Ligand binder design. Structure first.
Ligand SMILES: NS(=O)(=O)c1ccc(S(=O)(=O)Nc2cccc3c(Cl)c[nH]c23)cc1
Ligand SMILES: [Zn+2]
Lengths: 79, 62, 192, 781, 208
């Protein structure tokens, strides 16, 4: 019911890593980390879709602006 | 302009102007030293090193 | 020999449950019986490591704050390294516990990290790091596990050494999505 | 089953390393030269270079450094091979007896870690406290130099900088210190680290990290009193030492990349620098004495001395004499002097040493006789480019002063067709101009088709090797393939060229031509042209038809009575069809990444049939057909392999089996054809080594294989490397023992061992039986 | 950018040919999925996963139907030629899955003989979706033989144990739900490390 935008990620951060970091907040329907077709590597951005709205809200509050490797993660909303 | 005064190890070496045998080692093997690589992982080695130093920091008080 | 390790071995010819079969559907033959000479036989091995045991053993013998400890709640395990040459599995242990503070009373909820090396040949575990007892103030169960996994990721990236082109673990998954299927070593693409 | 015999006809001639020191004795000044697998030891004498001993190591020499630890009366030698065999060697002479003692040895390969871009780097601390090795990205390997311990326990230190360009140990440091240039997304930087043997870790370096030029490529560790480091870039040369920083941007170095250096003076006052154009410079470190007795570096200066052969390495010897170690041309001994000559040069060549490498192409001909074969190679590169005429070895050199690419002989015209390339530069007026005269600009007559590469087809006289005619291809047109043949029912013999249009905007060619030429009355006439949609990599005459490979397609063309090429059939199952060889109706295709495949032209169908493919990820360099069922391949990891058609189901027959495997230790560019053994295939390599491959019967192979095992028990190896380990097929993916291949060099070495050792080799056959066997085998080359 | 012909000319004179040089240039061959797929498998609806470690095969799965049945496929790749089906196996034998799994097919570093299929649902069921519990499904499947196999030849699609076996396992995980770590879990050439929330199991499968 709620979709979030995840950005400013290190090029070696995997979908499985993002699932692990975001899953403790609530149930996730779909996670899609955008990859480059030319030179197969992560684009540094993606979309995580929580089953619950309040679960997605707390994930943003506790992860937005906080460093993942040395890059501060940017978690936002859509539409 | 600045080339002059080149190193001289021996003057004789290039005074007389100019214009190799193959080494087949015969049965003789005298040696008493070998080269080996660190079997343990570098991340594990570091953590072991840090925790063993922490154990020494515990023995000094106790 | 130790109580924390459990080992099971089963042989097949034409703890976790196993539905070992052929390409069709025949459940093969579960046995340990004698079949002399290498005449094509299957071998399954199961070496377990009880987290509950490891946690209680490291707090009792290797934690300075071990005397303060009461009981633990949830625990999250993240592998930090696997050394195939020495058969050593380095696992990190996230722990939510109950403990009394310094003699400066009231029991409090804390979070800590336990790094443990696990030998696959012997099955014997060894403790390599016992973290500091950090207080859980105003932060939820989800918040503490997210912060923990982030630190595990932070460490593996910091210690990341590139591997040779031929020792890579291939990982394939498609959503219903991928645009191209690439063969990196032969520069061949399948456009979807 | 396929049994093959590989033997050296000509040892590698290219020099990859050269060092000076006191190895044979404390008094002797030595010159050590590494020629891939070969180590040459000389004494710098009154006459000028006295050869003392040449040893062949069972490995490709990657690191070669002389060092003197405490207690040693003379220098010891450290060698690391491409297969990571490490050894410390001592030269021992007792009267007339000479022995190379292995002081310590072991393999330092890591299962993990990926080989670095700038390759293996091996460095030794000036105080001989340790050996440092950069083998893989993210790791720094340290071998502690302790003499009072049974084993030299080497360890890895994690390096945060994953892309290091160059590294050296610094002089005048209380703690061993490395200085290195590395690249990251922010550019290139210079950093230092202290190396702690006690903690098995790095400590903060003596001086702060500094930013360097985008193309900073080499580090020079300056000796005391100066200390510090020199970093060589494309447009600048800088000096770094704690607070001290000097920077010069001489325009004289901008044109070409400096690729080698050598210290002239022990105190580091002068250095020699060699660039990609063969220019020789002197780098001068101007000093200033302080009142506290210490010497500081006041300024840096560069002076152009002259031109030498394109240097891979340089070594100052004695009395202004410099050894120029070349990989792309002939090596030299040059004299440096204060007074400039007629051209204004300060360099005079004293001696020239023949280098056949790289052999990019070759052909076997009967020029003077009828039954006597001579080898004609396309040798060297750039200004060093030449043709080499080799016969039973006698070598004749034909300088071209430009890069030869392909060669074909045309008997009816008594000439050779040679594809060549010359560099031209964009000037102020008109188009581009040649920087030096060469074969393509000095021909008797010339024609034109109806920094940058300018391609030509050269017609060279078979007797005088005079450039009779030069035909220049179109602007941006690169000539890739060449054949001399008759086609269809046409009685004329033609020079046929396959090309590609190369532009400074795109990566892959999407246009090219097949051009048919006829040489008559001292000129080349264009008979026909055929437009293609890619690069024509390879062409072979095929049963009166023209077989060609264009990008990923193999195509058969017919030559009409109207003098036109007409496409008959195509094969598309390729990534990059680079190499083609044929025998009857069978075609062997060599892929850049997919090993080899076998095709058959079907005359009754007018199409190709894909017979079988080798399902292995071999990055091919050359291919050859040994016979109807055996196919020879050479790949990027310096290995040879033999494929055979699997001898019930169509799928079984469609799978080629690798039946022969052998680590050659050379990079093969060309294979050409030209009772104990059967057949004769000659091969040319990047190091100028010439080898021969021949077939053996089952019984001959069995006897020679047993002979190898017996010889390996008697012949001792320098650095204690096992012969079987050396010849084992090796890639980053797998390591397998050699199979179906006999090392001819090893078996020939039987004739060189003493009579008491021969009897121990032939024990449970007589010595005379095998002497007769080996002697008849030496006659195959 | 460096031209492929300029890069190839470096090889001839240097003897240095490696993929870590062709790293920046575009792919040599690009072929669309629709031009190499057999038209008889259109109604099946295959979900192509990609290439195996060696460029010989191209893998795909089927999510056929409350009750989902999974199938793993091996297709013979030959550039522009049509894909030829080599192997078709039924994933997770005698296991009824009530929800669509997010499956992943993995390969060991040096072991080409076998593959692993890790399939998990978003959340477990007990018709009704049950929270704080998740089902993990893992299958170890043997790849088809590379060439002529003496044991495979003996038949009465009959394939020997070494080049034709399958393994299936299933475990329930609790909160916090364990992290999927394919690179570490299979770092040992013949072992699968599985976090069952309560214990870590070392699973080694080998044919002798
Ligand atoms: N080369 S790398 O980018 O460093 C790299 C990439 C993936 C893997 S993994 O497959 O083992 N996954 C993995 C590792 C560690 C933490 C987590 C969490 Cl949390 C979820 N999945 C994790 C290892 C190393
Ligand atoms: Zn089989």
């Amino acid at each position: 019911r709620m979709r979030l935008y995840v950005g400013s990620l290190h090029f070696n951060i995997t979908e499985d890593m993002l699932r692990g970091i975001f899953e403790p907040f609530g149930r996730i329907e779909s996670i899609q980390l955008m990859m480059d077709s030319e030179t197969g590597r992560s684009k540094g951005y993606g979309f995580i879709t929580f089953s619950d709205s309040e679960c997605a809200k707390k994930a943003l509050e506790q992860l937005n602006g906080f460093e993942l490797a040395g890059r501060p993660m940017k978690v936002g909303h859509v539409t | 302009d600045f080339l002059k005064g080149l190193p001289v190890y021996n003057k004789s070496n290039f005074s007389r102007f100019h214009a190799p045998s193959v080494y087949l080692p015969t049965r003789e093997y005298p040696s008493e030293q070998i080269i080996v690589t660190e079997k343990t992982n570098i991340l594990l080695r570091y953590l072991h090193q840090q925790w063993d130093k922490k154990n020494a920091a515990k023995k000094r008080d106790q | 020999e130790p109580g924390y390790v459990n080992y099971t071995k089963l042989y097949y010819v034409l703890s976790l449950p196993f539905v070992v079969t052929d390409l069709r559907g025949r459940n093969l033959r579960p046995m340990r019986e004698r079949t002399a000479v290498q005449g094509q036989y299957l071998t399954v091995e199961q070496l377990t490591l009880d987290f509950e045991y490891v946690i209680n053993e490291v707090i009792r013998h290797d934690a300075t704050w071990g005397h303060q400890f009461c009981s633990f709640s949830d625990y999250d395990i993240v592998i930090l390294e696997v050394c195939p040459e020495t058969n050593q599995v380095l696992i990190n242990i996230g722990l939510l516990l109950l403990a009394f503070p310094s003699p400066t009373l009231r029991p409090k909820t804390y979070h800590t990290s336990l790094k443990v090396a696990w030998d696959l040949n012997t099955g014997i575990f060894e403790t390599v790091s016992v973290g500091d007892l950090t207080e859980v103030k105003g932060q939820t169960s989800g918040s503490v596990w997210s912060s923990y996994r982030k630190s595990c990721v932070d460490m593996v990236m910091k210690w990341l050494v590139p591997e040779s082109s031929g020792r890579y673990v291939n990982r394939m998954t498609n959503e219903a999505s991928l645009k191209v299927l690439a063969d990196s070593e032969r520069y061949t693409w399948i456009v979807l | 089953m396929s049994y093959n015999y590989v033997v050296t006809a000509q040892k590698p001639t290219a020099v990859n390393g050269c060092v000076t020191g006191h190895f044979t004795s404390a008094e002797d000044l030595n010159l050590l030269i590494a020629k891939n697998t070969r180590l040459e030891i000389y004494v710098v004498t009154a006459e000028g270079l006295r050869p003392v001993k040449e040893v062949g190591m069972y490995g490709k020499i990657a690191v070669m450094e002389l060092f003197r630890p405490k207690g040693e009366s003379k220098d010891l030698l450290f060698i690391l091979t491409a297969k990571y065999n490490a050894c410390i060697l001592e030269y021992k002479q007792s009267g007339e007896s000479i022995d190379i003692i292995t002081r310590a040895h072991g393999n330092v390969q890591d299962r993990i870690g990926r080989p670095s871009e700038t390759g293996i780097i091996g460095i030794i601390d000036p105080e001989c406290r340790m050996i440092g090795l950069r083998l893989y990205d993210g790791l720094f390997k340290v071998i502690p130099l302790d003499r009072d311990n049974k084993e030299l326990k080497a360890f890895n230190i994690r390096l945060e900088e994953l892309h290091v360009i160059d590294v050296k140990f610094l002089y005048g440091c209380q703690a061993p210190t490395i200085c290195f240039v590395y690249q990251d997304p922010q550019g290139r930087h210079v950093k230092t680290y202290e190396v702690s043997l006690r903690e098995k870790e790095f400590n903060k370096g003596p001086w702060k990290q500094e930013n360097v030029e985008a193309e900073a490529s080499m580090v020079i560790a300056v000796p005391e009193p100066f200390g510090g480091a020199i970093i060589i870039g494309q447009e600048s040369i800088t000096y770094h030492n704690g607070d001290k920083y000097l920077a010069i941007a001489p325009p004289i170095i901008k044109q070409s990349t400096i690729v080698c250096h050598n210290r002239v003076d022990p105190n580091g006052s002068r250095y020699l620098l060699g660039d990609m154009e063969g220019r020789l410079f002197m780098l001068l470190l101007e000093k200033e004495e302080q009142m506290d007795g210490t010497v500081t570096l006041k300024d840096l200066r560069v002076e152009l001395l002259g031109e030498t052969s394109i240097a891979e390495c340089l070594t100052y010897l004695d009395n202004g004499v410099v050894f120029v170690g070349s990989r792309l041309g002939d090596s030299q001994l040059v004299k440096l002097n204060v007074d400039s000559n007629e051209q204004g040069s300060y360099v005079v060549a004293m001696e020239t040493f023949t280098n056949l490498g790289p052999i990019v192409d070759m052909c076997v001909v009967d020029l003077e006789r009828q039954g006597q074969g001579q080898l004609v190679t396309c040798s060297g590169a750039f200004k060093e480019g030449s043709l080499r005429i080799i016969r039973n070895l006698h070598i004749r050199t034909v300088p071209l002063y430009e890069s030869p690419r392909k060669i074909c002989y045309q008997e009816v015209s008594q000439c050779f067709g040679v594809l060549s390339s010359r560099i031209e530069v964009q000037d102020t007026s008109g188009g581009t101009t040649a920087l030096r005269p060469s074969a393509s600009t000095q021909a008797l007559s010339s024609s034109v088709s109806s920094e940058v590469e300018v391609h030509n087809l050269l017609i060279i006289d078979q007797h005088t090797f005079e450039v009779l005619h030069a035909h220049q291809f179109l602007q941006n047109e690169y000539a890739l393939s060449l054949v001399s043949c008759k086609l269809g029912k046409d009685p004329n013999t033609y020079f046929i060229v396959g090309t590609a249009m190369v532009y400074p905007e795109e990566a892959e060619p999407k246009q090219g031509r097949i051009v048919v030429f006829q040489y008559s009355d001292g000129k080349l006439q264009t008979v026909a042209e055929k437009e293609v949609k890619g690069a024509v990599y390879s062409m072979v005459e095929f049963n009166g038809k023209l077989l060609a490979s264009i990008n990923s397609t193999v195509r058969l063309y017919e030559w009409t009575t109207e003098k036109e090429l007409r496409t008959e059939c195509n094969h598309y199952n390729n990534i990059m069809a680079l190499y083609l060889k044929t025998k009857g109706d069978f075609i062997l295709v060599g892929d850049l990444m997919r090993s080899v495949l076998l095709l058959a032209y079907k005359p009754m169908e007018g199409n190709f049939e894909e017979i079988a493919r080798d399902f292995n990820p071999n990055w091919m360099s050359a291919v050859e057909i040994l016979d109807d069922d055996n196919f020879l391949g050479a790949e990027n990891a310096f290995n040879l392999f033999v494929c055979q058609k699997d001898s019930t189901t169509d799928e079984e027959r469609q799978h080629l089996q690798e039946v022969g495997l052998f680590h050659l230790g050379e990079f093969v560019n060309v294979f050409c054809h030209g009772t104990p053994t059967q057949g004769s295939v000659l091969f040319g390599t990047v190091n100028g080594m010439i080898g021969l491959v021949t077939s053996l019967s089952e019984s001959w192979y069995n006897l020679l294989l047993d002979m190898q095992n017996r010889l390996n028990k008697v012949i001792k190896s320098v650095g204690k490397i096992e012969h079987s380990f050396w010849r084992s097929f090796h890639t980053e993916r797998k390591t397998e023992p050699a199979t179906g291949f006999i090392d001819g060099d090893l078996i020939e070495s039987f004739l060189d061992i003493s009579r008491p050792k021969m009897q121990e080799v032939v024990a449970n056959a007589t010595a005379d039986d095998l002497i007769k066997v080996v002697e008849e085998l030496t006659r195959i080359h | 950018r460096e031209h492929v012909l300029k890069q190839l000319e470096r090889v001839k004179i240097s003897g240095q040919l490696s993929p870590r040089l062709f790293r920046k240039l575009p792919p040599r061959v690009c072929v669309s999925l629709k031009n190499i797929v057999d038209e008889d498998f259109l109604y099946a609806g295959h979900i192509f996963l990609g290439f195996s470690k060696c460029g010989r095969y191209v893998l795909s799965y089927t999510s056929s139907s409350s009750f989902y049945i999974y199938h793993l496929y091996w297709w013979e790749f030959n550039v522009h030629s049509k894909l030829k089906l080599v192997r078709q196996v039924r994933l997770f034998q005698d296991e009824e899955i009530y929800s669509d799994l997010y499956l992943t097919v993995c390969e060991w570093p040096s072991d080409a003989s076998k593959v692993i299929v890790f399939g998990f649902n978003t959340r477990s069921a007990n018709m009704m979706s049950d929270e704080n519990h998740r089902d993990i499904y893992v299958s170890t499947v043997a790849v088809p033989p590379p060439g002529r196999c003496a044991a495979c030849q003996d038949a009465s699609n009959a394939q020997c144990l070494r080049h034709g076996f399958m393994l299936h396992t299933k475990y329930q995980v609790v909160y916090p739900f364990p992290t999927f770590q394919p690179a570490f879990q299979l770092k040992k050439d013949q072992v699968v490390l599985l976090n069952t929330s309560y214990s870590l199991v070392a699973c080694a499968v080998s044919v002798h």
